[model samples]
Target: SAFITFEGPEGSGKTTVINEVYHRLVKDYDVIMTREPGGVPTGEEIRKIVLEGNDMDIRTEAMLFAASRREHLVLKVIPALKEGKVVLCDRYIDSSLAYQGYARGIGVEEVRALNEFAINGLYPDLTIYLNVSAEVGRERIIKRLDQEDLKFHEKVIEGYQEIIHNESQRFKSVNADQPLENVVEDTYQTIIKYLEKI
Candidate 1:
């Protein structure tokens, strides 16, 4: 089973590119494409509470994400992988490490340790990091009228860059500043190359 993850800051085109890759791969392999905080019914509920932008404590937010992940793994990811599927998940432990740890000043190592306890060290085999500038990403979010607040989005972008800088081998960065078609094609190529090795 191949475990791949697509990760990036909000409005970085991770969703668009992942859909393209999923469409292309489903024709040849047993594939499962999903996003975190909502892969399963229970997780989806958690997603709503976390994203509602209410007055939740940062630690509580982190714990919610972790709980959602635990349920998602049991109800969705593990089943698909056991069936020999290539699971493509958008945002996993790295998001917590970046958002809560690096950006929120919780410390990456500490966040990673907590996540390790939550996930039992089940990490993605490959992570596609869509690299987009903070300025471009912020503009895209505003243009789309997304509900995410600007400050939060900026911090998320910073966290993603920090992850890439520290874990270049596990996280492969793709230039997201290119045309949409080019971005999709480049990402597809990267996945294929990684597949060849695995």
Candidate 2:
């Protein structure tokens, strides 16, 4: 069994692609679906607080996210993993590293340390990065964000790149701008290779 996480920019089709990949995976492996901030009951509650559209403090956001992640790991993810399940996580520590660390103006190392303590040192064995350009990513949505808005989207990808660079052995990149069938095909190929190793 292995832990696989998905990461991508907004509107990059990570969710849709993961679902399609999930259906394909279930036939051969003991796979289970989960998403960050929605992985378990407590995480979902924290997700409610986060998505409720309030002006939350950066410090509070960081703390709450870590707390929820800890609970979800202990209650749901870890148990299934022990049972030899492929944990198909939609997002994981990388989200905290990018969103809370770079996007929220908190340092990456700072958030990394916090999440490390929270998750008790567990890390994903594989990370699938869906690469997409900033403008193209915003294309599907009607958000004609200002020039500054586009800059933030770009920075998130930059953060993800840096993380992938530092952990090259664990990351696999795929072009996300292609059609749905191609994306799923690329991911399936990756999963097939990873299965051979595990």
Candidate 3:
């Protein structure tokens, strides 16, 4: 089973590209696509609180994310992987490493340690890091900011960079600054390369 993850900051077009990739792959393999902290109902509730609740501290948010991940792993991810499915996850521990750790100043090491415990060392087989500049990312998010502030979104971009720098081997950075079609094609090629090797 191939466990691939799509990770990046907001506005990197991860959702767009991952959906494209998932649809393409579903015909050939048993594919399971999900976003972290909310693949299932239990995790979805946690996601609501973590992303929507502004009163929570950074550490508290991180802990909640980890908890949600644990539940998702036990109930959804593990079973799918064991059944020989290709799990295409959108945002995983790396998000916590960047968003909560580096961006929020909670320390990546600390966040990683917590996530390590949460997922019990089940890292992604390959992580496609959709790279986009903070300026461009911020602009994209500004068009539809939802409830997130600019500063928080900016930090998330910084976090993604830190993650790419530290985990180069696990991460394959794709240029999200390009046109949507180009980005999707390049991302598809990357995944195909990994699949061929496996």
Worst 10 residues of 3 by lDDT: 140-149
Clashing residue pairs in all predictions, respectively, total: 0, 0, 0
List lDDT for all candidates, in order: 0.83, 0.84, 0.85
Give the candidate number with the greatest TM-score: 2
Residues 131-185, candidate 3: write the lDDT tens digits: 9887777676665554446677778877888778777898899999887688899
Cα RMSD of predicted structure 1: 2.6
lDDT of candidate 1 over 1-198, digit per residue (tens)? 888988888768888899998999888878889877544888889889889957888888888888898888778888888998889998898889889887777788888878887788778889998888877787766654445576678788788887788778888888987776888999999988988787
- lDDT of each residue in 1-198, candidate 2, tens digit only: 888889987867888899999999999888998876654778888878877848988878988889888888888789989999999888888988988888777989999999999988788889899887666788844436788777788888888877788888888998888876898899889987998887
State the lDDT at 51 in candidate 3. 76
Give the distance in Å from residue 106's predicted Cα in candidate 3 to where it truly belongs: 1.1
**Candidate number that wins on TM-score, 1 or 3:** 3
Candidate 1 lDDT at 110 equals 82
TM-score of each: 0.89, 0.92, 0.90
Cα RMSD, each candidate: 2.6, 1.8, 2.4
Which segments of model 2 are wrong by more than 4 Å? Answer: none
The alpha-carbon lDDT assigned to residue 88 of candidate 2 equals 88
Candidate 3 stretches with Cα past 4 Å from truth are: 51-54, 143-148
Residue 40 lDDT, candidate 3, scale 0-100: 80
* Residue 34 of model 1, lDDT score: 83
